[PDB]
Write a structure and sequence with these properties.
The structure is cut from a larger assembly and holds chains A (53 residues) and B (64 residues). By secondary structure, chain A is mainly beta. Chain A has no helices and 4 strands. A 4-stranded antiparallel beta sheet of chain A has the order 2-1-4-3, with no helix packed on it. Chain A is elongated. The interface between A and B is small, with 6 and 3 residues. Bound molecules: magnesium ion (242 copies) and zinc ion (ZN). One magnesium ion (MG) binds next to loops of chain B. Chain B binds 7 RNA strands through helix 2, strand 3 and helix 3. Chain A: Part of the 50S ribosomal subunit.
RNA sequence: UGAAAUACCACCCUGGCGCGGCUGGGGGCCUAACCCUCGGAUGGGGGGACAGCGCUUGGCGGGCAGUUUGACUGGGGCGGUCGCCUCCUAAAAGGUAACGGAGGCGCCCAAAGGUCCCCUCAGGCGGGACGGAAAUCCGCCGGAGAGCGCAAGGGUAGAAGGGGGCCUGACUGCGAGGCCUGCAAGCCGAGCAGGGGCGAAAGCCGGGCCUAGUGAACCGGUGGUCCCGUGUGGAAGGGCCAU
RNA sequence: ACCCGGUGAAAUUGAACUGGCCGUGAAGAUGCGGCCUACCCGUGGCAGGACGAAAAGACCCCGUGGAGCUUUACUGCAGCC
RNA sequence: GUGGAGCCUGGGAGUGAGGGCGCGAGCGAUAACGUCCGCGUCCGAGCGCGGGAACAACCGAGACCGCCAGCUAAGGCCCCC
RNA sequence: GCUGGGGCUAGGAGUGAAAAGCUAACCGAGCCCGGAGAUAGCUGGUUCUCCCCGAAAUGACUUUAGGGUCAGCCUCAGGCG
RNA sequence: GUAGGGAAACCGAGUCCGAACAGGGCGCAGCGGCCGCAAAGUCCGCGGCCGUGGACCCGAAACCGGGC
RNA sequence: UGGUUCGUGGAGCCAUGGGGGAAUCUGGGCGGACCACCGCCUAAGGCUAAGUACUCCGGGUGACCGAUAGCGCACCAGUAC
RNA sequence: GGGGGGAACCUGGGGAACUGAAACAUCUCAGUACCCAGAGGAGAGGAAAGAGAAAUCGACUCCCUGAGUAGCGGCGAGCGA
């Protein structure tokens, strides 16, 4: 982690709860991460969006 | 005069029915982003303090 | 005739002036609080709503006050050092010290991750426009001396190296059993369930060839949860999960 | 100062029946070993030793000891604005 | 292999200044009664006993008490002895 | 200039032709009583007898290093065998 | 002391995490021929050691208050 | 600001140095911010035995001392100094 | 009528520090020591603008208990209804 490599949360698109924390290099990957992850509230896989930590 | 209960122990620890001392795992208070789900999960459990340290802590809780 | 259309009576906008209500600053003057003074004082004079003094705001402040001002160390100081990784010292299990000998870390990668499929190096010689010791091409030899992001070591092509397709397991809920170990930490982990990825399948997948890339509590932030809620319903404020 | 008559302290002091050398020993021995030397007891003198006396080293270091002092160390306070 | 062996639970500690020697290394100078680890040992706590002239740790040997008895150990057997 | 008598100023205070001088024979903060048996991880000291066992001076961590906590090593009771 | 588990609501020989009827954590349990005995536990005495007090005894330099 | 278990905390209650400043039961304070509901209580005047504290004084009694003990003092002692 | 005195005890007005936190500042020691005013054989307090959840209790003081609980706390040391 640094200034260029940030920490971030992954928010489930369907219920809005933050289920994961991870990182990215925001110079190499300036767009918000979107990733399918298992949401334990929805109890199914769901697109998660990068959200500020 | 009578002993006072140590309140830092009383707020961190429990004596079980059989006289073990149980506390919360350390290490997930912060800096968690890069910790695996395995580490976060297993740190959510209680654990039994080693016997030497459990004996000392129980002496701090004379009325539990 | 436009969106609205007309005389006339309302309420109220815009903005302005003028009278006053009311108060904010400033300028001036006044005296009587308050202060100074005057053989004389229920008075005269001077200052004057300032100054002084009360409460409160922020500031300057060794004049003074309480203290702090680390350890290791061939004495102490000075210099260096302080955690973590690799090798050696280390006496063929493990461990093992010195201000012993050498180097590195405080990152990184959205692929440099998962899976399926395919591929194989460095180097030497010979041959080939610009083209060279070395650019790219062809042939022969070449088991690993290349590569694997970065130190070193171990490991490694019967791939952990190179390329491509589809992907997000860089999972959630757990966890038999162990390694290590004073504690607390740190490490490895089959297997079961949930919902998935790749594969025809057997299967693999809970990040990365591996070992550094890190920080216990306390205090506080943010998202969620809807567990507590000081007579009751709420609320304030907490707890729990995540960061 | 010394001798006689009178009066008569002190620090110090484990106990002592308390010699030299060469060795040894916690590394400078009257006290251990070997050897040498040495009849018993005083008096006046000299200071090499008894690591002689005095003062629980002032130097030096150590103690998460103290105190005085300094400042653009920290945090307050008086004072002043 | 029955030993002041071992394992489990609990009560009480003390110690956390080590030191010599032998061997294996590092540091030092193939120096130090030097220094820092490892294996062992003794002194520490066996300054109890014999030997080594004397002498914590070298050699011999683990002192319950008594004997004017015997055998040995290291080391010794010309005199001190 | 020196000096008698009579007075005034004191403890973070006085006084000082300035030496941190002096303030009742030791002043970088007087003396007395009190808080008070301050605190001292330091030094010293710790008192009858016999019997059995019998250490440690290491590791980790420590504003820690001559102090501690845990472990190691000693001991006692019960249990196992 | 006779119930524990859970932050808690709460449930209870269980409970907590969990979607779980999964897995795991913490819990849950007499000898004899009815009477004995022996026992939870608890009370009191005694002894070791620990906590609070000066806490084995003596010892500062100092700090503070009120006076002289 | 103080008091309280409450150290600014969600900080109520009781007290009050400063500023502002009511009402008379349809008044007012409280039940831990606050609001509603439901209740409790009557502030800004005063007094009030007893149960409680102490021991200069008197008495009684000690698994209390016995002249370095016990009060500092058994005695012409808060004296001598 | 007051004044002054009285061993402790009591109330009010002021109010430390060593120390503890193994440093130290908040915190602790402690509203203690001590200074002062006053009281009396006692003093203070006292007849709910109380408590706080009982559809409840019924001045105050004092003992036991509640309870080292609830809580407070560099959520430390500790403090403590
Ligand atoms: Mg606490
Ligand atoms: Mg934690
Ligand atoms: Mg933390
Ligand atoms: Mg958290
Ligand atoms: Mg948090
Ligand atoms: Mg990672
Ligand atoms: Mg993970
Ligand atoms: Mg994660
Ligand atoms: Mg979880
Ligand atoms: Mg209880
Ligand atoms: Mg209980
Ligand atoms: Mg004028
Ligand atoms: Mg005038
Ligand atoms: Mg005038
Ligand atoms: Mg004028
Ligand atoms: Mg003014
Ligand atoms: Mg103001
Ligand atoms: Mg101000
Ligand atoms: Mg300053
Ligand atoms: Mg100063
Ligand atoms: Mg202090
Ligand atoms: Mg400091
Ligand atoms: Mg420091
Ligand atoms: Mg040092
Ligand atoms: Mg040096
Ligand atoms: Mg050295
Ligand atoms: Mg040295
Ligand atoms: Mg030296
Ligand atoms: Mg330096
Ligand atoms: Mg470490
Ligand atoms: Mg090794
Ligand atoms: Mg090795
Ligand atoms: Mg080895
Ligand atoms: Mg091992
Ligand atoms: Mg060094
Ligand atoms: Mg470096
Ligand atoms: Mg790719
Ligand atoms: Mg080639
Ligand atoms: Mg060529
Ligand atoms: Mg060419
Ligand atoms: Mg070429
Ligand atoms: Mg290679
Ligand atoms: Mg590199
Ligand atoms: Mg691939
Ligand atoms: Mg791929
Ligand atoms: Mg697809
Ligand atoms: Mg295990
Ligand atoms: Mg462990
Ligand atoms: Mg590690
Ligand atoms: Mg599955
Ligand atoms: Mg599946
Ligand atoms: Mg599948
Ligand atoms: Mg398929
Ligand atoms: Mg499958
Ligand atoms: Mg797996
Ligand atoms: Mg990699
Ligand atoms: Mg890879
Ligand atoms: Mg890595
Ligand atoms: Mg880690
Ligand atoms: Mg803290
Ligand atoms: Mg919190
Ligand atoms: Mg919440
Ligand atoms: Mg609720
Ligand atoms: Mg309420
Ligand atoms: Mg409520
Ligand atoms: Mg409502
Ligand atoms: Mg409700
Ligand atoms: Mg609401
Ligand atoms: Mg809430
Ligand atoms: Mg968390
Ligand atoms: Mg004569
Ligand atoms: Mg004479
Ligand atoms: Mg003699
Ligand atoms: Mg003689
Ligand atoms: Mg010699
Ligand atoms: Mg000598
Ligand atoms: Mg000699
Ligand atoms: Mg002699
Ligand atoms: Mg002799
Ligand atoms: Mg001899
Ligand atoms: Mg001799
Ligand atoms: Mg001799
Ligand atoms: Mg002789
Ligand atoms: Mg001679
Ligand atoms: Mg003579
Ligand atoms: Mg002489
Ligand atoms: Mg002379
Ligand atoms: Mg001599
Ligand atoms: Mg001499
Ligand atoms: Mg001399
Ligand atoms: Mg001398
Ligand atoms: Mg002497
Ligand atoms: Mg002394
Ligand atoms: Mg000395
Ligand atoms: Mg000295
Ligand atoms: Mg001296
Ligand atoms: Mg000096
Ligand atoms: Mg020195
Ligand atoms: Mg010093
Ligand atoms: Mg320090
Ligand atoms: Mg220290
Ligand atoms: Mg100091
Ligand atoms: Mg000082
Ligand atoms: Mg001072
Ligand atoms: Mg034995
Ligand atoms: Mg033994
Ligand atoms: Mg046996
Ligand atoms: Mg034991
Ligand atoms: Mg015992
Ligand atoms: Mg004992
Ligand atoms: Mg020790
Ligand atoms: Mg110890
Ligand atoms: Mg030590
Ligand atoms: Mg040592
Ligand atoms: Mg030593
Ligand atoms: Mg050693
Ligand atoms: Mg040493
Ligand atoms: Mg040796
Ligand atoms: Mg050796
Ligand atoms: Mg040999
Ligand atoms: Mg050799
Ligand atoms: Mg050697
Ligand atoms: Mg070596
Ligand atoms: Mg030479
Ligand atoms: Mg040596
Ligand atoms: Mg040597
Ligand atoms: Mg050597
Ligand atoms: Mg040795
Ligand atoms: Mg010793
Ligand atoms: Mg021996
Ligand atoms: Mg021995
Ligand atoms: Mg011997
Ligand atoms: Mg000896
Ligand atoms: Mg002998
Ligand atoms: Mg001998
Ligand atoms: Mg001999
Ligand atoms: Mg001999
Ligand atoms: Mg010897
Ligand atoms: Mg020797
Ligand atoms: Mg024997
Ligand atoms: Mg014979
Ligand atoms: Mg022989
Ligand atoms: Mg001979
Ligand atoms: Mg003979
Ligand atoms: Mg005069
Ligand atoms: Mg005069
Ligand atoms: Mg005079
Ligand atoms: Mg004057
Ligand atoms: Mg004066
Ligand atoms: Mg005075
Ligand atoms: Mg003074
Ligand atoms: Mg004073
Ligand atoms: Mg002062
Ligand atoms: Mg002054
Ligand atoms: Mg003068
Ligand atoms: Mg005097
Ligand atoms: Mg003088
Ligand atoms: Mg001073
Ligand atoms: Mg002073
Ligand atoms: Mg004087
Ligand atoms: Mg006094
Ligand atoms: Mg005190
Ligand atoms: Mg003292
Ligand atoms: Mg001190
Ligand atoms: Mg004693
Ligand atoms: Mg024995
Ligand atoms: Mg050690
Ligand atoms: Mg540690
Ligand atoms: Mg450290
Ligand atoms: Mg260390
Ligand atoms: Mg040190
Ligand atoms: Mg040292
Ligand atoms: Mg120490
Ligand atoms: Mg221990
Ligand atoms: Mg053993
Ligand atoms: Mg036994
Ligand atoms: Mg509970
Ligand atoms: Mg839950
Ligand atoms: Mg279960
Ligand atoms: Mg079980
Ligand atoms: Mg019975
Ligand atoms: Mg019983
Ligand atoms: Mg104990
Ligand atoms: Mg005490
Ligand atoms: Mg004391
Ligand atoms: Mg005591
Ligand atoms: Mg004690
Ligand atoms: Mg003094
Ligand atoms: Mg002080
Ligand atoms: Mg001071
Ligand atoms: Mg004074
Ligand atoms: Mg207020
Ligand atoms: Mg307050
Ligand atoms: Mg307060
Ligand atoms: Mg709070
Ligand atoms: Mg409050
Ligand atoms: Mg209210
Ligand atoms: Mg007021
Ligand atoms: Mg008020
Ligand atoms: Mg009413
Ligand atoms: Mg009203
Ligand atoms: Mg009120
Ligand atoms: Mg109010
Ligand atoms: Mg109320
Ligand atoms: Mg009556
Ligand atoms: Mg009365
Ligand atoms: Mg009464
Ligand atoms: Mg009485
Ligand atoms: Mg009497
Ligand atoms: Mg008697
Ligand atoms: Mg008698
Ligand atoms: Mg007498
Ligand atoms: Mg007497
Ligand atoms: Mg007598
Ligand atoms: Mg007496
Ligand atoms: Mg008397
Ligand atoms: Mg007399
Ligand atoms: Mg008066
Ligand atoms: Mg008076
Ligand atoms: Mg009176
Ligand atoms: Mg008062
Ligand atoms: Mg007054
Ligand atoms: Mg006061
Ligand atoms: Mg008072
Ligand atoms: Mg004061
Ligand atoms: Mg203090
Ligand atoms: Mg103290
Ligand atoms: Mg204390
Ligand atoms: Mg303490
Ligand atoms: Mg302290
Ligand atoms: Mg301390
Ligand atoms: Mg200090
Ligand atoms: Mg302090
Ligand atoms: Mg206080
Ligand atoms: Mg008193
Ligand atoms: Mg009076
Ligand atoms: Mg009475
Ligand atoms: Mg009264
Ligand atoms: Mg009254
Ligand atoms: Mg009334
Ligand atoms: Mg109770
Ligand atoms: Mg208090
Ligand atoms: Zn969701």
């Amino acid at each position: 982690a640094s200034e260029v490599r940030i920490k971030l949360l992954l928010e489930c698109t369907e219920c809005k709860r933050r289920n994961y924390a991870t990182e990215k290099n925001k110079r190499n990957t300036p767009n918000k991460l979107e990733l399918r992850k298992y949401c334990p509230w929805c109890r199914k896989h769901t697109v998660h969006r990068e959200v500020k930590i | 005069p009578k002993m006072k209960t140590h309140k830092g122990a009383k707020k961190r620890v429990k004596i079980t029915a059989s006289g073990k001392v149980v506390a919360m795992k350390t290490g997930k208070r912060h800096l968690n982003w890069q910790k695996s789900g395995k580490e976060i999960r297993q740190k959510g459990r209680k654990f039994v303090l080693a016997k030497p340290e459990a004996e000392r802590i129980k002496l701090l809780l004379p009325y539990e």
